[PDB]
Enzyme design. Structure first.
Site, PDB file in Angstrom:
ATOM      1  CG  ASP A 516      18.323 -35.565 -20.520  1.00 36.60           C
ATOM      2  OD1 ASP A 516      17.517 -36.254 -21.191  1.00 36.60           O
ATOM      3  OD2 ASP A 516      19.561 -35.642 -20.647  1.00 36.60           O
ATOM      4  CE  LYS A 610      27.216 -29.249 -16.750  1.00 32.13           C
ATOM      5  NZ  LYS A 610      25.892 -29.015 -17.379  1.00 32.13           N
ATOM      6  CG  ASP A 791      20.094 -37.638 -15.066  1.00 35.09           C
ATOM      7  OD1 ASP A 791      20.549 -38.350 -15.985  1.00 35.09           O
ATOM      8  OD2 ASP A 791      20.649 -36.593 -14.693  1.00 35.09           O
TER       9      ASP A 791
END
Length: 862
Positions: A516, A610, A791
Site C-alpha cells: 500500500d 487523521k 493504491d
DNA sequence: TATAGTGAGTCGTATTA
DNA sequence: TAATACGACTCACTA
C-alpha cells in the site's frame, strides 16, 4: 459495425460460437447463461429450487400481469410507466425489480425513492432494448454446437488457465456498441416507481418511509427493507440463493477492450459496458477516437488475472456469520436494537424529549446500516458459494472519469475484509524463501503490525507461530484470528502459512500479498514537486522507521494547544460589546485558552486528526471543514456521555479546524501550494468572459482538461442539473412527487469545478501510476496475476519481491520524465484564458527531493 | 461524472372504453 | 360522453 452490419440472428450466435471455439461449449454456454441472469431467471434454476425468490418472483409476476389488465380495462390516459413496461416480458420485469431493489439496499446511506427507481428504470431499459437478441441468443446456446468432440470438450483439465482471446480474433459482431441509456429520466423514474409500487403490493419486501417531514434540506422518501425479510436474510442459510448481483464474475477470460464500449462481458443480449464511466454519452464519446495503447494494455492485463474462491475461508465464513454472537465484531448482529424506553415522564419538555428524539433517531440509523451490511454480506456469500468449485473466475474492469480502475461485479477483489478473504489468486508458484518472507509481512499487515519496520513484523509472526497454527487447525475453536485488524484476510494468511509448515518452501502459494502507498496523493504531490520534506512525511525516502503524517500533524496540533493553554485569548464576556443592550446572547467567545484546554481535556490523537484530515478538501467535504469536525468528533462525544468539556460545541469545532489546517499547511507546504495553483487554474477556466456593459461573450465557461502520463485524457465538467418534479399517485394512497435531476444540463458549476480539481488530478495521477505499474510488472518481470485497489498492489508470494520493486520503478520513471504540472499548464494556456491571464500563474518551485531515493524506500510502497 | 425536498389543492389536457 | 393520469404551479412544512 455490430449495429446494423449484422442480423439479430447473427449477433445472437456470434458470441456463443467464438466462446465455444476456445474454452468449449460447456463454459461457453455457462458464461452466457450467467450473463442472462441479469435480466431473467432461467426456468431451469427456479423450478429446481422446490429461498425467498421462490415466493417473491411468482407473487410479483402475477401482480404485473394483473396491473396490465386493470390498465387496459379503463378509459383515459394510460400511465406513463405502462407505455414502456407494456412491451417487456413480465418475468424479466419482476426479476429485475427484485434484484435491483435488494442491491440498492446494500447502500447504508442513499436509498431514496429516486436512487432506487432510477436504478430499476435503467435496468428495465437494458431489457427492452437487447431483449430480442437475448431471447435468440438463449435459444442458440441451448443447442449443442456442431460436431468434433475435441473442440467441444472445451475445458480439458489442462493445468494452465484459459487464455484471453486475441484482439484480431474477434468478429466485428462482437465490437460492442451503446452503453448509454436513451430514455429521459422522467420516464425511467416513472417506470422505476411503478415497479417498486407493485413489489410493495404483491409482496411486502419493502416499504416507503418519509424522512424529516418539513425540513427543506432533509425531507426524503426512502425504501426500507421490511423487518420480516431482514430477519429471514439474517437468520436463514441461502435466503438470497437465486438472487445474484446484477454484475457477476466471468467463468472464462473476459472479452478484451479494443474500444470505447463492449469490453469485459461476452453476451450480445445485454447492455454493453462503457470503458469509462462518464456523466453523459457526450463525455464518453470524447474517448472514441483517442488512441491510448498503454491504457487498453493495462486494463486488459488486469482483466486477464485469474481468481478462485478460497474454500477454507468460505467454510468458516458460512458458519460464523450465522451465529448470534460473531467473533468477528464487524459482522452485523442478527438481533435488533430496541428503542430507548421513553422516560415515562416524556411529556416533560426539557431537552429530554429532544435528546431522546436524537437517541431513537440514532438507533434507527444504526439498524438501517445493520440491515444493509447484512444484505451485502449475504450477497457476497451467495456469490462465493456459487463459484466455490470453479477452477477459476475472472473480473472484467472499468475506469471512472478520472481513469481509476474498478472491478465491475459486486463481489470483487476490491471489496471489504471478508470479500477479499474469500478470494485468492488462481495460478500460483512454489513460494520459496523470498516469497515466504513477504507472506509473513502480509500476515503482519493483516494484523495491526504495519507502522513498524519489517524485522519487527517478521518478529511478530514468529512469536505467534503456535497461535497462527492453532487458528489454521481449528478456526472455529481458536478465534485469535477473528480479533485481528483484517480478520478474514488474516485467517487466509494463517491457512497459507500452515501450508508452508507442512510442505516446505516448495509449497505452491497464490494468496495475493499487498503493498500500500502511505498517504496517496501527498506522495504524488511531493514527487511531482520534488518536495523532500513533504515526501519524507509520506514515505518517499529510506528512513529507519515508518513515518506517519497523521501522527506528525497531531503532534504539531498539540504543541499549539500547549501554546494556547499557557497564553492565548481569554473568554470575552457575552457578545454585547459592539453595540448596546438586549442581545447578551453569544454570552461567550471562548478565548483560545479555554478552547485549547477543552481539546487537551479531550485528547487530540492521531485518530482525531487523521479522519479529520481526510474528510476536508482532498476526499469528500461539503461546505465547512469544521462543520464536519463538530459532527464527527464533538457531536458523537457529547452524544456518548463525554464531550462535557465542549461548553460551546460550535466554537470548539471552529477552533480545531484552523489548527489542523494550520498544522498540515506547514507539514506539507509544497503540496498545499500545488493545490491552490490547481484551484486557481480551475476558477479561471470556469469563469466567463465579461466586461463593462457589452457583456458579450468571447469565451463561455470551460471544463478543465488534462492528460495523464500514460496517455489517459480526462475532462472535468461539473454541471448544474435542470431539475423538475414528477407527480405520481402512489398505491392509490398519496401523490409521490419526487424531485429529480434531468439528463439535461444548464451551465458549468463554477464552485464544484474548483473544489474538485486537486483531488481529481491526483487520483487520475495515481490511476495512471497503477496502470503503468501493471504494464511494467507484466512485461519486465513475469507477473501475470494482479490484485489492484487504487493504491494497494498485490500478487502471489513468489512475484512479490519484483512487484515491490516495480511500483517504485514506475513511480520514479514517470516523474523523472514528466512534469505533469507544466504539462497541465500547456493545456489550459491556449484554449483557456482570453486576454487577462494574470494573478493565477507562477508554477510552484521544484524541490530538492531525489526521486531515485524512492527506489531504496522500504515503506514507500506505491 | 453518480445524483435528485415533500404532499395537497387546483386547473387544464390529450386520451380512450 | 366523461373518466383517467399527471404536468405545471403555489403554499406551507410535523421543523
Amino acid at each position: 459495425i455490430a449495429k446494423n452490419d449484422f442480423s439479430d440472428i447473427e449477433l445472437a450466435a456470434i458470441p456463443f460460437n467464438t466462446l465455444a471455439d476456445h474454452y468449449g461449449e460447456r463454459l461457453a454456454r455457462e458464461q452466457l447463461a450467467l450473463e442472462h441472469e441479469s435480466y431473467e431467471m432461467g426456468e431451469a434454476r427456479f423450478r429446481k429450487m422446490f429461498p425467498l425468490i421462490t415466493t417473491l418472483l411468482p407473487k410479483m409476476i402475477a401482480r404485473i400481469n394483473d396491473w396490465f389488465e386493470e390498465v387496459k380495462a379503463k378509459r383515459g390516459k394510460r400511465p406513463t410507466a405502462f407505455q414502456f413496461l407494456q412491451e417487456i416480458k413480465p418475468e424479466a420485469v419482476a426479476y429485475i425489480t427484485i434484484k435491483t431493489t435488494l442491491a440498492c439496499l446494500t447502500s447504508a446511506d442513499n436509498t431514496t425513492v429516486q436512487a432506487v427507481a432510477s436504478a430499476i428504470g435503467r435496468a428495465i431499459e437494458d431489457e427492452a432494448r437487447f431483449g430480442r437478441i437475448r431471447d435468440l441468443e438463449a435459444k442458440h446456446f441451448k443447442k449443442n454446437v456442431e460436431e468434433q468432440l475435441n473442440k467441444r470438450v472445451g475445458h480439458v483439465y489442462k493445468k494452465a488457465f484459459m487464455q484471453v482471446v486475441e484482439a484480431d480474433m474477434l468478429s466485428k459482431g462482437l465490437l460492442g456498441g451503446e452503453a448509454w441509456s436513451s430514455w429521459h429520466k422522467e420516464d425511467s423514474i416513472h417506470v422505476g416507481v411503478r415497479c417498486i409500487e407493485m413489489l410493495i403490493e404483491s409482496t411486502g419486501m419493502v416499504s416507503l418511509h418519509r424522512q424529516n417531514a418539513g425540513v427543506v434540506g432533509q425531507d426524503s422518501e426512502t425504501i426500507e427493507l421490511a423487518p420480516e425479510y431482514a430477519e429471514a436474510i439474517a437468520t436463514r442459510a441461502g435466503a438470497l440463493a437465486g438472487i445474484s448481483p446484477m454484475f457477476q464474475p466471468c467463468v472464462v477470460p473476459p472479452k478484451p477492450w479494443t474500444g470505447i464500449t463492449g469490453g469485459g462481458y461476452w453476451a450480445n443480449g445485454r447492455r454493453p459496458l462503457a470503458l469509462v464511466r462518464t456523466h453523459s454519452k457526450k463525455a464518453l464519446m470524447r474517448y472514441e477516437d483517442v488512441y491510448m495503447p498503454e491504457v487498453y494494455k493495462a486494463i486488459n492485463i488486469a482483466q486477464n488475472t485469474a481468481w478462485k474462491i478460497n474454500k477454507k475461508v468460505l467454510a468458516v465464513a458460512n458458519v460464523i456469520t450465522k451465529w448470534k454472537h460473531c467473533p468477528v465484531e464487524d459482522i452485523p448482529a442478527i438481533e435488533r436494537e430496541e428503542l430507548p424506553m421513553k422516560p415515562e415522564d416524556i411529556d416533560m419538555n426539557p431537552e429530554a424529549l429532544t435528546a431522546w428524539k436524537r437517541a431513537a433517531a440514532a438507533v434507527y440509523r444504526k439498524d438501517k446500516a445493520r440491515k444493509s451490511r447484512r444484505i451485502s454480506l449475504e450477497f457476497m456469500l451467495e456469490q462465493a458459494n456459487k463459484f466455490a468449485n470453479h477452477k477459476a473466475i475472472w473480473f472484467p474492469y472499468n475506469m471512472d472519469w478520472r481513469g481509476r480502475v474498478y472491478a465491475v461485479s459486486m463481489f470483487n477483489p476490491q471489496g471489504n475484509d471478508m470479500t477479499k478473504g474469500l478470494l485468492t489468486l488462481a495460478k500460483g508458484k512454489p513460494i520459496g524463501k523470498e516469497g515466504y518472507y513477504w507472506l509473513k509481512i502480509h500476515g503482519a499487515n493483516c494484523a495491526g503490525v504495519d507502522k513498524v519496520p519489517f524485522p519487527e513484523r517478521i518478529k511478530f509472526i514468529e512469536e505467534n507461530h503456535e497461535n497462527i497454527m492453532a487458528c489454521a487447525k481449528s478456526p472455529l475453536e481458536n478465534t485469535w484470528w477473528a480479533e485481528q485488524d483484517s480478520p478474514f484476510c488474516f485467517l487466509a494468511f494463517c491457512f497459507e502459512y500452515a501450508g508452508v509448515q507442512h510442505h516446505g518452501l516448495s509449497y505452491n502459494c497464490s494468496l495475493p500479498l499487498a503493498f500500500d502507498g502511505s498517504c496517496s496523493g501527498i506522495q504524488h504531490f511531493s514527487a511531482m514537486l520534488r518536495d523532500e520534506v513533504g515526501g519524507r512525511a509520506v514515505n518517499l525516502l529510506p528512513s529507519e522507521t515508518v513515518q506517519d503524517i497523521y501522527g506528525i500533524v497531531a503532534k504539531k496540533v498539540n504543541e499549539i494547544l500547549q501554546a494556547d493553554a499557557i497564553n492565548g485569548t481569554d473568554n470575552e464576556v457575552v457578545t454585547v460589546t459592539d453595540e448596546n443592550t438586549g442581545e447578551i446572547s453569544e454570552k461567550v467567545k471562548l478565548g483560545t485558552k479555554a478552547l485549547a484546554g477543552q481539546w487537551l481535556a479531550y485528547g487530540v490523537t492521531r485518530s482525531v486528526t487523521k479522519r479529520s484530515v481526510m474528510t476536508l478538501a482532498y476526499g469528500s467535504k461539503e461546505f465547512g471543514f469544521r462543520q464536519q469536525v463538530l459532527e464527527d468528533t464533538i457531536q458523537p462525544a457529547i452524544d456518548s456521555g463525554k464531550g462535557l468539556m465542549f461548553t460551546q460545541p460550535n466554537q470548539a469545532a471552529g477552533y480545531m479546524a484552523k489548527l489542523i489546517w494550520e498544522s498540515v499547511s506547514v507539514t506539507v507546504v509544497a503540496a498545499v501550494e500545488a493545490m491552490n495553483w490547481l484551484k486557481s487554474a480551475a476558477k479561471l477556466l470556469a469563469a466567463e468572459v465579461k466586461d463593462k456593459k457589452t457583456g458579450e461573450i468571447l469565451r463561455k465557461r470551460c471544463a478543465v482538461h488534462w492528460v495523464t502520463p500514460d496517455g489517459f485524457p480526462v475532462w472535468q465538467e461539473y454541471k448544474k442539473p435542470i431539475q423538475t418534479r414528477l407527480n405520481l399517485m402512489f398505491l392509490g394512497q398519496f401523490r409521490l412527487q419526487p424531485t429529480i435531476n434531468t439528463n439535461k444540463d444548464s451551465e458549468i458549476d463554477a464552485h464544484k469545478q474548483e473544489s474538485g480539481i486537486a483531488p481529481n488530478f491526483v487520483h487520475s495521477q495515481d490511476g495512471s501510476h497503477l496502470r503503468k505499474t501493471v504494464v511494467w510488472a507484466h512485461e519486465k518481470y513475469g507477473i501475470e496475476s494482479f490484485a489492484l485497489i487504487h493504491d494497494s498492489f498485490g500478487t502471489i508470494p513468489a512475484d512479490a519481491a519484483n512487484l515491490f520493486k516495480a511500483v517504485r520503478e514506475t513511480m520514479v520513471d514517470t516523474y523523472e520524465s514528466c512534469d505533469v504540472l507544466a504539462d497541465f499548464y500547456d493545456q489550459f494556456a491556449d484554449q483557456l484564458h482570453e486576454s487577462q491571464l494574470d494573478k493565477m500563474p507562477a508554477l510552484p518551485a521544484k524541490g530538492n527531493l531525489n526521486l531515485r531515493d524512492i527506489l531504496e524506500s522500504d515503506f514507500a510502497f506505491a
